[PDB]
RNA sequence: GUGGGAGAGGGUGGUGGAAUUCCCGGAGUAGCGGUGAAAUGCGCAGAUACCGGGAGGAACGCCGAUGGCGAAGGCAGCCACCUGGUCCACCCGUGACGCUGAGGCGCGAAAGCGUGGGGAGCAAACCGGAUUAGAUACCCGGGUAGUCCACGCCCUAAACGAUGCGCGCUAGGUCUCUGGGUCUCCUGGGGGCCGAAGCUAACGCGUUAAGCGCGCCGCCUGGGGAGUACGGCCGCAAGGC
């Protein structure tokens, strides 16, 4: 059981319905792999530095979770299935390292 | 010798390991998309070494450029 | 990996008395744990040699400690072997 | 016959030859020139002067499409790069900007023996 | 043992962007390329230069260093899992359990071999163009094995610090990586430079010893013949000891 962070970037052109369905699938899969959600941040659409999937912007989701390590990789797979989901990056959480303090 | 400005001293309290904060990291990138050297960033070995991996992370997420085109010249 | 709870389990298990972390029995026990875990790791990933070196070093240390026990107190030696199930 | 009137100027320069391509803002080309278009044949194409002639010929060809302002794009490290720049600078064409786009790999491909002792 | 740290140490899966080549579409015209100068070559079946989309293979730009890790070979995009080594603080535990190490066993760059796959760029052999007295070369245009993956062999090297491993002792100055502390500084581990005593044929070495000592292993005994011949062992062969 380790504490991770799930970054998900998906299609900015989605209407509220399709988007809701996507987040629904995310939550669903998360429950399937048994990841407790500690907190969440929805950053919305933002300007990318380079075009992703031909589209200049992207919609961001961030989930701080706790899940069994052994399935983490196996989880990412699922999240990458959706065509609407163009990026998935999972990171082991880390205590912030401050500079100029 | 880079006597113009040191990026660290030009900034306040901030987290180096945080990959989601662009408005800071962007200051650590050159005119081109390249990661600035120790002379310019004014960091230390440890700091710079962490900032490197975080910047790369930000690049993969699409927040930071891999490369840019040089203006003027 | 090897979590603290497991380690305290085997330590408290083999300890000659309460509060003993350093006995030959304890050491041989810990080493046997690590060795078994590593071998199970090298059934898969058999192309990873750098770790196999570590396995050789651990095996060596265990054999030396066990040798020491065998010299000092053959009873405790046979006991340790029996509870651990080493030597094949 | 288009009448674009605003466009892009691509300078491709190497130690061997300099070649200029003028395009619309979509990137599609209109006209082009090079040291070969002018009477120069051999090594003389890698000249600053060859470059000047090239950029000027491309400019003149592109005036006939009635163009005025261009963005210059520089690629390659070669002789007659800055000279082709200066040529376009006042050809009568207004130079809106200059940008070096020269492709640098992240080290994908092994170079020819000529370019090696690097990666 | 407890608590902390740094790291391109290793293995498996996934993944990102730049570039090269090929393909498709748009636009566009007479050359591109390459050299000391050229030609072969490619181009009117529309090349080069430019924009858009797609496929595939290989390597990871800046960070990056006089840096870090590893026993050595060696290791560099990013993420996750599995996993080795190691350092510091606390003085907690066992109680000489140590050091070296013939033989053995394992690892071992590149090239090379077997089977299957892959093949973008580069490129032995080879096909050509130049140069030259000749040019079985240097330079130029092509190009097969190979370079890439998996599994199995091969065991070589300027496999280098041309310096076996471990422990103790013998001025300091300075730079640096990485811990801890009363954080001007002290203390510990690693990487560099100049230098005390001392050593060395000299160059140089000098708390990272090539100094002062002890233990154990390996090796040398004038040059060519020759790492050859024979024998044995190993190898599918090349060939190795
Ligand atoms: N190992 C790969 C690297 O691990 C890094 O993290 C590594 C280190 O930072 C971390 O250090 C650990 C930690 O518990 C703490 N600092 C002390 C501890 N002794 C260390 O554990 C160490 O020893 C054990 C055997 O006892 C090994 O199994 C382990 O690999 C080694 N790191 O253990 C991690 C695994 O070795 C980063 N994830 C990244 O650089 C990379 O993935
Ligand atoms: N690809 C990631 C790496 O794969 C390694 O091994 C992998 C690759 O070496 C091997 O080949 C893969 C495969 O998908 C298929 N044959 C083609 C594919 N392009 C390759 O993957 C890789 O190829 C090369 C490195 O060889 C990289 O340059 C490239 O980015 C990457 N796609 O396939 C293996 C897995 O199927 C190791 N697991 C580790 O280094 C790392 O995870
Ligand atoms: K011709
Ligand atoms: K080094
Ligand atoms: K400190
Ligand atoms: K002397
Ligand atoms: K010297
Ligand atoms: K040998
Ligand atoms: Mg997808
Ligand atoms: Mg030892
Ligand atoms: Mg030329
Ligand atoms: Mg590593
Ligand atoms: Mg075409
Ligand atoms: Mg050609
Ligand atoms: Mg051809
Ligand atoms: Mg022809
Ligand atoms: Mg025709
Ligand atoms: Mg082309
Ligand atoms: Mg393209
Ligand atoms: Mg292909
Ligand atoms: Mg470098
Ligand atoms: Mg070293
Ligand atoms: Mg005590
Ligand atoms: Mg006692
Ligand atoms: Mg030994
Ligand atoms: Mg031996
Ligand atoms: Mg080998
Ligand atoms: Mg090989
Ligand atoms: Mg083969
Ligand atoms: Mg084959
Ligand atoms: Mg070629
Ligand atoms: Mg060739
Ligand atoms: Mg020839
Ligand atoms: Mg001659
Ligand atoms: Mg063959
Ligand atoms: Mg051998
Ligand atoms: Mg050397
Ligand atoms: Mg030295
Ligand atoms: Mg060394
Ligand atoms: Mg030494
Ligand atoms: Mg030895
Ligand atoms: Mg040696
Ligand atoms: Mg030792
Ligand atoms: Mg030592
Ligand atoms: Mg020191
Ligand atoms: Mg080193
Ligand atoms: Mg000296
Ligand atoms: Mg003296
Ligand atoms: Mg002297
Ligand atoms: Mg050494
Ligand atoms: Mg010594
Ligand atoms: Mg010898
Ligand atoms: Mg010998
Ligand atoms: Mg003789
Ligand atoms: Mg000889
Ligand atoms: Mg020989
Ligand atoms: Mg023989
Ligand atoms: Mg035989
Ligand atoms: Mg032969
Ligand atoms: Mg031969």
Q: Which of D19, D90, D74 has its CA nearest to residue D51?
A: D19
Count, in order, helices (H) and strands (E) of chain C: 4, 0
Chain E positions within 7 A of any protein Cβ atom are 1-3, 6-20, 26-39, 48-54, 57-65, 67, 70-73, 77-85, 92-94, 96-98, 106-108, 120-123, 139-141, 150-152, 176-179
Residue B43 CB in 7 A reach of strand E: no
C34 neighbors C2 (Cβ within 8 angstroms): yes
Q: Which CATH class is domain C1-88?
A: mainly alpha
Helix (H, G, I), strand (E, B) or coil at B47: helix
CATH of A1-101, one of 3.30.160.20, 3.40.50.300, 3.40.50.1110, 3.30.70.60: 3.30.70.60
Alpha carbon distance D75, D112 (integer Å): 20
Two tokens, residue D23 = 């395009």
CA angle B20, A11, B26 (to 5 degrees): 25
CATH number at residue B64: 4.10.640.10
Number of structural domains in chain B = 1
Sign of the four-CA dihedral A47, A53, A55, A56: positive
C55 CA to E84 C1' in angstroms comes to 8
Please state the domain extents for chain D: 1-119
Enclosing domain of residue B9: 1-73
Contacts (Cβ under 8 Å, ≥6 apart) of D1: D65
Please state the domain extents for chain A: 1-101
Residue B24 buriedness (CB in 10 A; 0-12 / 13-18 / 19+): middle
Experimental method: X-ray
Instruction: Classify domain D1-119 at the CATH superfamily level.
Output: Ribosomal protein S11/S14 (3.30.420.80)
Between chain A and chain D, are at least 3 CB pairs below 8 A? no
D32 neighbors D60 (Cβ within 8 angstroms): no
Q: Which of D18, D20, D21 has its CA nearest to residue D43?
A: D18
Residue C74 CB in 7 A reach of strand E: no
How many CA within 13 A on the CB side of residue B9?
8
A84 neighbors A11 (Cβ within 8 angstroms): yes
Q: How far is the CA of C87 from the centre of ligand 55 (A)?
A: 50
Contacts (Cβ under 8 Å, ≥6 apart) of D103: D75
Instruction: Give me the resolution in angstroms, 1 decimal.
Output: 3.4
Q: Which of B41, B42, B49 has its CA nearest to residue B17?
A: B49
Contacts (Cβ under 8 Å, ≥6 apart) of A65: A3, A4, A5, A6, A30, A35, A36, A37, A38
């Amino acid at each position: 059981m380790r504490r991770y962070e799930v970054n998900i970037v998906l299609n900015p052109n989605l209407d509220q319905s399709q988007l809701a369905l996507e987040k629904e699938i995310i939550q669903r899969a998360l429950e399937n792999y048994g990841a407790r959600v500690e907190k969440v941040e929805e950053l919305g659409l933002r300007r990318l530095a380079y075009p992703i999937a031909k589209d200049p912007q992207g919609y961001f989701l961030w989930y701080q979770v706790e899940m069994p390590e052994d399935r983490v990789n196996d989880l990412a797979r699922e999240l990458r299935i959706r065509d609407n989901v163009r990026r998935v990056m999972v990171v082991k959480s880390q205590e912030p390292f401050l500079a100029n303090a | 010798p880079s006597r113009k400005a040191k990026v660290k001293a030009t900034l306040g309290e901030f987290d180096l390991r945080d990959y989601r904060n662009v408005e800071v990291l962007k200051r650590f990138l050159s005119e081109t998309g390249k990661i600035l050297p120790r002379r310019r960033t004014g960091l230390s070995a440890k700091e710079q070494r962490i900032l490197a991996k975080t910047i790369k992370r930000a690049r993969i997420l699409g927040l930071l450029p891999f490369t840019e085109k040089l203006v003027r010249k | 990996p090897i979590t603290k709870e497991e380690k305290q389990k085997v330590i408290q298990e083999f300890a000659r008395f309460p509060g003993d972390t350093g006995s030959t029995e304890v050491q041989v026990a810990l080493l046997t744990l690590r060795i078994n875990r590593l071998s199970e790791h090298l059934k898969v990933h058999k192309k990873d040699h750098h770790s196999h070196r570590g396995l050789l070093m651990m095996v060596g240390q265990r054999r030396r400690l066990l040798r020491y026990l065998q010299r000092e107190d053959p009873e405790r030696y046979r006991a340790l072997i029996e509870k651990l199930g080493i030597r094949g | 016959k288009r009448q674009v009137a605003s466009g892009r100027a691509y300078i491709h320069a190497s130690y061997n030859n300099t070649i200029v391509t003028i395009t619309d803002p979509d990137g599609n080309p209109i006209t082009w020139s090079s040291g070969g278009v002018i009477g120069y044949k051999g090594s003389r194409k890698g000249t600053p002067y060859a470059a000047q002639l090239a950029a000027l010929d491309a400019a003149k060809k592109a005036m006939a499409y009635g163009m005025q302002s261009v963005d210059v794009i520089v690629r390659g490290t070669g002789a007659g790069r800055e000279q082709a720049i200066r040529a376009l600078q006042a050809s009568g064409l207004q130079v809106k900007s200059i940008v070096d786009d020269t492709p640098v790999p992240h080290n994908g491909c092994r170079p020819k023996k000529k370019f090696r002792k690097a990666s």
